[PDB]
Amino acid sequence: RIPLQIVRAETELSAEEKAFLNAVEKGDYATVKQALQEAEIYYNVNINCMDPLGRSALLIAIENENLEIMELLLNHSVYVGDALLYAIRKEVVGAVELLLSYQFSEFTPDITPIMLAAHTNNYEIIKLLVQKRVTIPRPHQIRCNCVECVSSSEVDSLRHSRSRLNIYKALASPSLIALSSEDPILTAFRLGWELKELSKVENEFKAEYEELSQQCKLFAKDLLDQARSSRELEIILNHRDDLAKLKVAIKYHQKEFVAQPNCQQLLATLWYDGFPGWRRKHWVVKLLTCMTIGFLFPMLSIAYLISPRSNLGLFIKKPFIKFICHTASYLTFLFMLLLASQHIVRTDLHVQGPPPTVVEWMILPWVLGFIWGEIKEMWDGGFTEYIHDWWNLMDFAMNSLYLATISLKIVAYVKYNGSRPREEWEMWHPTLIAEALFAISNILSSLRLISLFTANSHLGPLQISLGRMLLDILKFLFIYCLVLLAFANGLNQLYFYYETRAIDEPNNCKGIRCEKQNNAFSTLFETLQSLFWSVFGLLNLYVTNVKARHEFTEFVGATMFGTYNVISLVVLLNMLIAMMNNSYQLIADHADIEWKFARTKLWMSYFDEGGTLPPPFNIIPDSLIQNQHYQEVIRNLVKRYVAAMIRNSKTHEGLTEENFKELKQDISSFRYEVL
Amino acid sequence: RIPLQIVRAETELSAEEKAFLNAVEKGDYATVKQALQEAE
Ligand SMILES: CC(C)CCC[C@@H](C)[C@H]1CC[C@H]2[C@@H]3CC=C4C[C@@H](OC(=O)CCC(=O)O)CC[C@]4(C)[C@H]3CC[C@]12C
Ligand SMILES: [Ca+2]
Ligand SMILES: [Zn+2]
């Protein structure tokens, strides 16, 4: 028996106010008029009476979209505050125009009429409001130590965050950008960048800021989509405040703008400069032409040096031929790196400091060219973006290992004279370190070729997904390294008392890299190595067996080894499978825009004159007219976009409501004509 | 304090054209006819 009563009692109005509110809601030109006259004379009705469910007389008159009752209430001095916002949110032009011609609320007090109009994204209401000289407060910069931001955040943090989000939502509407900004493309780019960088700062309101940034990027792409000619697209892309706006969009990570089909057409025509209709030809003749131009890599580079402006000197200046020549030079470098480890060119293996062979003497200009190119990349173009590549770390590692190999070879040549057999050299002979670093640099140089996958149409998205899933490999190795450190600590602590010597063990071998694996858990480094190698099954089971008859210690060690194997394989590897499968499933939707953005970024790196020579040969010693043309193009694009959007806003629901309103008005007019 | 004005100003028609366009949009056999006669 649960008793049910209204615990929050609302003060109900008198019966005289109910008649006035019912006359307002039903709609009557005479009953409301005489009710207001009686309220003026006898004071029977409070004019500012309000329903318990947040509905004043003016709000109900707005909800009925009738202008006569609204005009009479406006002339009868009804409380008009917080009533234009309801008409704006209802999105009716006549009521907003009438209220602009002159307690409880459903809107937060920081909302202005222009802000709500921008939130609702109605073109006519926003235009009619901005004609009345309205302004929006400027949101502050993200990192503020000023008093006006810090004190406001300290006093009322929720109101501050709500006000900032409301302002940024008002500024990000496509209609307000199309009306109030003279450069909607650059405004959309900048607002998308600020909203994306601000979503990470305000990590709790991340979804709304990410949605607003996506809205701005979509508006920029849709504004570019309305181009009806190649001249308009060339004017858009070349506008400088060669392809300036495309470089700006690449800077602001506008992947949807970059991967637009007409931008990709213009980039493809600029890429195949010397080949009219490269996509037209057969794949066999394309492969033959690519092979010929690649095999002509000593050519077209000497000709550039001896005659830059000849018939043949301008052949390498085209971007595709430049890319082919660079790829051919790198493949030749890797071929000589393969040849450097062969018996035909490498002899006299028992000298402490050897002079370089012919293959290494040929390798040296390539290494100097790579070093000089990476040095020039630090200066030319800039330094703040050189580290913002994530491929230049690999190049820096390659060049550092090359420099270390050269310096160690020089030291071993100048301080070691004579010959000595290789078995009696010391552990840290400079020659051995040089041969190790050269091999590591060979691995890095041959793995550098993955960056060329974005040019191909089939290996590009594959490398994009490879990066996507390496981002989760990086997360998985933290848990794996914690588990590895835990079990290594435990196993070394259990097993370090039974450490033997290399002399006692057979073949003078102490470690897990022997025929009979010895001292697998004796030291912490060897324990880490053993627990790493047990993942691939290369650690045998008898390494947990000690010389003495300590069967309890052996059993506890084998149990630790089995628990580590279970945790590190059965749980963790299949967890990694599930993680990368989920990440691949998410990225497979947006996998072609990313590849097209990466291919575009690779294409614009070959457009400029800098770095024309391959690394073998790169070490051998009025604005008003453009602004007005861009302004006409923006005017046409904005008009086309606003027309397409304004009738794409026509909806079955709104059309149906409009038809009922027109039918009701016409029936009432006909009834008044008959009566 | 971000100022908001229409940067791409459209040449608005005269008030006489607004009456003709409103008569066309609302639907009137007589108002559009007399408007066209006055335009002639
Ligand atoms: C499977 C083994 C034998 C590979 C050995 C390494 C190289 C011989 C391969 C690996 C990556 C390959 C590259 C992968 C992608 C491309 C881009 C591709 O570009 C185009 O098709 C041109 C048109 C465009 O840019 O879209 C031309 C071949 C090339 C350089 C490939 C040339 C041959 C490379 C260097
Ligand atoms: Ca580089
Ligand atoms: Zn501030």
PDB file of N, CA and C in Angstrom, chain A residues 59-105:
ATOM      1  N   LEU A  59       3.890  32.774 -24.735  1.00  0.00           N
ATOM      2  CA  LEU A  59       4.508  31.543 -25.221  1.00  0.00           C
ATOM      3  C   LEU A  59       3.495  30.657 -25.936  1.00  0.00           C
ATOM      4  N   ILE A  60       2.274  30.571 -25.403  1.00  0.00           N
ATOM      5  CA  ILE A  60       1.223  29.793 -26.053  1.00  0.00           C
ATOM      6  C   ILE A  60       0.803  30.457 -27.361  1.00  0.00           C
ATOM      7  N   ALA A  61       0.764  31.794 -27.382  1.00  0.00           N
ATOM      8  CA  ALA A  61       0.454  32.509 -28.617  1.00  0.00           C
ATOM      9  C   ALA A  61       1.533  32.291 -29.673  1.00  0.00           C
ATOM     10  N   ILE A  62       2.792  32.180 -29.245  1.00  0.00           N
ATOM     11  CA  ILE A  62       3.873  31.819 -30.160  1.00  0.00           C
ATOM     12  C   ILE A  62       3.680  30.399 -30.678  1.00  0.00           C
ATOM     13  N   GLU A  63       3.299  29.474 -29.790  1.00  0.00           N
ATOM     14  CA  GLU A  63       3.097  28.081 -30.178  1.00  0.00           C
ATOM     15  C   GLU A  63       1.933  27.896 -31.145  1.00  0.00           C
ATOM     16  N   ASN A  64       0.974  28.819 -31.166  1.00  0.00           N
ATOM     17  CA  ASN A  64      -0.161  28.734 -32.076  1.00  0.00           C
ATOM     18  C   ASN A  64       0.085  29.434 -33.406  1.00  0.00           C
ATOM     19  N   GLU A  65       1.285  29.998 -33.600  1.00  0.00           N
ATOM     20  CA  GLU A  65       1.705  30.848 -34.718  1.00  0.00           C
ATOM     21  C   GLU A  65       0.600  31.752 -35.265  1.00  0.00           C
ATOM     22  N   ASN A  66      -0.073  32.487 -34.386  1.00  0.00           N
ATOM     23  CA  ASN A  66      -1.063  33.478 -34.785  1.00  0.00           C
ATOM     24  C   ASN A  66      -0.577  34.862 -34.380  1.00  0.00           C
ATOM     25  N   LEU A  67      -0.480  35.762 -35.358  1.00  0.00           N
ATOM     26  CA  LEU A  67       0.127  37.067 -35.142  1.00  0.00           C
ATOM     27  C   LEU A  67      -0.829  38.092 -34.551  1.00  0.00           C
ATOM     28  N   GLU A  68      -2.143  37.891 -34.688  1.00  0.00           N
ATOM     29  CA  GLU A  68      -3.103  38.860 -34.165  1.00  0.00           C
ATOM     30  C   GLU A  68      -3.114  38.865 -32.639  1.00  0.00           C
ATOM     31  N   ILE A  69      -3.176  37.679 -32.029  1.00  0.00           N
ATOM     32  CA  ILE A  69      -3.165  37.579 -30.573  1.00  0.00           C
ATOM     33  C   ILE A  69      -1.818  38.031 -30.024  1.00  0.00           C
ATOM     34  N   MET A  70      -0.735  37.715 -30.741  1.00  0.00           N
ATOM     35  CA  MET A  70       0.591  38.167 -30.334  1.00  0.00           C
ATOM     36  C   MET A  70       0.691  39.689 -30.372  1.00  0.00           C
ATOM     37  N   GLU A  71       0.118  40.316 -31.405  1.00  0.00           N
ATOM     38  CA  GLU A  71       0.146  41.773 -31.509  1.00  0.00           C
ATOM     39  C   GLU A  71      -0.687  42.428 -30.413  1.00  0.00           C
ATOM     40  N   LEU A  72      -1.863  41.866 -30.112  1.00  0.00           N
ATOM     41  CA  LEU A  72      -2.679  42.411 -29.027  1.00  0.00           C
ATOM     42  C   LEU A  72      -2.004  42.247 -27.668  1.00  0.00           C
ATOM     43  N   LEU A  73      -1.341  41.111 -27.432  1.00  0.00           N
ATOM     44  CA  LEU A  73      -0.631  40.932 -26.168  1.00  0.00           C
ATOM     45  C   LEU A  73       0.579  41.857 -26.079  1.00  0.00           C
ATOM     46  N   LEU A  74       1.251  42.105 -27.206  1.00  0.00           N
ATOM     47  CA  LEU A  74       2.362  43.052 -27.211  1.00  0.00           C
ATOM     48  C   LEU A  74       1.878  44.470 -26.939  1.00  0.00           C
ATOM     49  N   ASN A  75       0.714  44.834 -27.484  1.00  0.00           N
ATOM     50  CA  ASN A  75       0.142  46.147 -27.209  1.00  0.00           C
ATOM     51  C   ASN A  75      -0.455  46.240 -25.810  1.00  0.00           C
ATOM     52  N   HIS A  76      -0.713  45.108 -25.158  1.00  0.00           N
ATOM     53  CA  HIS A  76      -1.288  45.090 -23.820  1.00  0.00           C
ATOM     54  C   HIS A  76      -0.240  44.929 -22.722  1.00  0.00           C
ATOM     55  N   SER A  77       1.042  45.137 -23.049  1.00  0.00           N
ATOM     56  CA  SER A  77       2.150  45.176 -22.085  1.00  0.00           C
ATOM     57  C   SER A  77       2.313  43.852 -21.333  1.00  0.00           C
ATOM     58  N   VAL A  78       2.345  42.761 -22.087  1.00  0.00           N
ATOM     59  CA  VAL A  78       2.684  41.453 -21.536  1.00  0.00           C
ATOM     60  C   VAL A  78       4.202  41.356 -21.434  1.00  0.00           C
ATOM     61  N   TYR A  79       4.687  40.702 -20.370  1.00  0.00           N
ATOM     62  CA  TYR A  79       6.110  40.458 -20.157  1.00  0.00           C
ATOM     63  C   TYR A  79       6.734  39.751 -21.354  1.00  0.00           C
ATOM     64  N   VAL A  80       7.652  40.441 -22.031  1.00  0.00           N
ATOM     65  CA  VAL A  80       8.165  39.998 -23.323  1.00  0.00           C
ATOM     66  C   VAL A  80       9.533  39.332 -23.192  1.00  0.00           C
ATOM     67  N   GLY A  81      10.139  39.364 -22.009  1.00  0.00           N
ATOM     68  CA  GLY A  81      11.464  38.789 -21.850  1.00  0.00           C
ATOM     69  C   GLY A  81      11.440  37.277 -21.982  1.00  0.00           C
ATOM     70  N   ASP A  82      12.515  36.741 -22.574  1.00  0.00           N
ATOM     71  CA  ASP A  82      12.692  35.308 -22.841  1.00  0.00           C
ATOM     72  C   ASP A  82      11.538  34.752 -23.678  1.00  0.00           C
ATOM     73  N   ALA A  83      11.128  35.512 -24.696  1.00  0.00           N
ATOM     74  CA  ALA A  83      10.090  35.078 -25.617  1.00  0.00           C
ATOM     75  C   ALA A  83      10.521  35.085 -27.073  1.00  0.00           C
ATOM     76  N   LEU A  84      11.504  35.906 -27.447  1.00  0.00           N
ATOM     77  CA  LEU A  84      12.055  35.842 -28.795  1.00  0.00           C
ATOM     78  C   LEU A  84      12.807  34.537 -29.023  1.00  0.00           C
ATOM     79  N   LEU A  85      13.411  33.986 -27.966  1.00  0.00           N
ATOM     80  CA  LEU A  85      14.154  32.736 -28.086  1.00  0.00           C
ATOM     81  C   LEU A  85      13.238  31.571 -28.438  1.00  0.00           C
ATOM     82  N   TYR A  86      12.022  31.556 -27.884  1.00  0.00           N
ATOM     83  CA  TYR A  86      11.065  30.505 -28.219  1.00  0.00           C
ATOM     84  C   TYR A  86      10.642  30.583 -29.681  1.00  0.00           C
ATOM     85  N   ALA A  87      10.433  31.798 -30.193  1.00  0.00           N
ATOM     86  CA  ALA A  87      10.054  31.960 -31.593  1.00  0.00           C
ATOM     87  C   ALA A  87      11.211  31.617 -32.523  1.00  0.00           C
ATOM     88  N   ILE A  88      12.444  31.890 -32.089  1.00  0.00           N
ATOM     89  CA  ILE A  88      13.618  31.525 -32.877  1.00  0.00           C
ATOM     90  C   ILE A  88      13.783  30.010 -32.926  1.00  0.00           C
ATOM     91  N   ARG A  89      13.649  29.344 -31.777  1.00  0.00           N
ATOM     92  CA  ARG A  89      13.786  27.891 -31.724  1.00  0.00           C
ATOM     93  C   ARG A  89      12.644  27.188 -32.450  1.00  0.00           C
ATOM     94  N   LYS A  90      11.447  27.780 -32.447  1.00  0.00           N
ATOM     95  CA  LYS A  90      10.330  27.223 -33.204  1.00  0.00           C
ATOM     96  C   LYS A  90      10.526  27.402 -34.709  1.00  0.00           C
ATOM     97  N   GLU A  91      11.383  28.349 -35.108  1.00  0.00           N
ATOM     98  CA  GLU A  91      11.762  28.615 -36.500  1.00  0.00           C
ATOM     99  C   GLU A  91      10.556  29.030 -37.345  1.00  0.00           C
ATOM    100  N   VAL A  92       9.942  30.139 -36.941  1.00  0.00           N
ATOM    101  CA  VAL A  92       8.917  30.817 -37.726  1.00  0.00           C
ATOM    102  C   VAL A  92       9.373  32.255 -37.961  1.00  0.00           C
ATOM    103  N   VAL A  93       9.290  32.701 -39.215  1.00  0.00           N
ATOM    104  CA  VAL A  93       9.853  33.998 -39.580  1.00  0.00           C
ATOM    105  C   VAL A  93       8.971  35.135 -39.080  1.00  0.00           C
ATOM    106  N   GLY A  94       7.648  34.958 -39.151  1.00  0.00           N
ATOM    107  CA  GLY A  94       6.736  36.053 -38.849  1.00  0.00           C
ATOM    108  C   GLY A  94       6.767  36.473 -37.392  1.00  0.00           C
ATOM    109  N   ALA A  95       6.790  35.498 -36.481  1.00  0.00           N
ATOM    110  CA  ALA A  95       6.833  35.817 -35.057  1.00  0.00           C
ATOM    111  C   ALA A  95       8.158  36.464 -34.671  1.00  0.00           C
ATOM    112  N   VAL A  96       9.269  35.980 -35.233  1.00  0.00           N
ATOM    113  CA  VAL A  96      10.574  36.578 -34.951  1.00  0.00           C
ATOM    114  C   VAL A  96      10.626  38.011 -35.466  1.00  0.00           C
ATOM    115  N   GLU A  97      10.105  38.242 -36.675  1.00  0.00           N
ATOM    116  CA  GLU A  97      10.060  39.593 -37.227  1.00  0.00           C
ATOM    117  C   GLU A  97       9.166  40.509 -36.396  1.00  0.00           C
ATOM    118  N   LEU A  98       8.040  39.987 -35.903  1.00  0.00           N
ATOM    119  CA  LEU A  98       7.125  40.805 -35.112  1.00  0.00           C
ATOM    120  C   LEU A  98       7.715  41.156 -33.752  1.00  0.00           C
ATOM    121  N   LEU A  99       8.349  40.192 -33.079  1.00  0.00           N
ATOM    122  CA  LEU A  99       8.954  40.494 -31.785  1.00  0.00           C
ATOM    123  C   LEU A  99      10.220  41.330 -31.929  1.00  0.00           C
ATOM    124  N   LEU A 100      10.872  41.293 -33.093  1.00  0.00           N
ATOM    125  CA  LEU A 100      11.984  42.202 -33.334  1.00  0.00           C
ATOM    126  C   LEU A 100      11.530  43.575 -33.808  1.00  0.00           C
ATOM    127  N   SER A 101      10.278  43.710 -34.238  1.00  0.00           N
ATOM    128  CA  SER A 101       9.708  45.002 -34.596  1.00  0.00           C
ATOM    129  C   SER A 101       9.062  45.711 -33.412  1.00  0.00           C
ATOM    130  N   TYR A 102       8.996  45.053 -32.252  1.00  0.00           N
ATOM    131  CA  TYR A 102       8.413  45.587 -31.014  1.00  0.00           C
ATOM    132  C   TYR A 102       6.971  46.064 -31.186  1.00  0.00           C
ATOM    133  N   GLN A 103      11.918  34.242 -13.639  1.00  0.00           N
ATOM    134  CA  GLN A 103      11.230  33.004 -13.293  1.00  0.00           C
ATOM    135  C   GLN A 103      11.787  31.828 -14.087  1.00  0.00           C
ATOM    136  N   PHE A 104      10.953  30.812 -14.298  1.00  0.00           N
ATOM    137  CA  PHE A 104      11.392  29.617 -15.005  1.00  0.00           C
ATOM    138  C   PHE A 104      11.545  29.895 -16.495  1.00  0.00           C
ATOM    139  N   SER A 105      12.607  29.346 -17.081  1.00  0.00           N
ATOM    140  CA  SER A 105      12.849  29.454 -18.511  1.00  0.00           C
ATOM    141  C   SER A 105      13.564  28.198 -18.982  1.00  0.00           C
TER     142      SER A 105
END
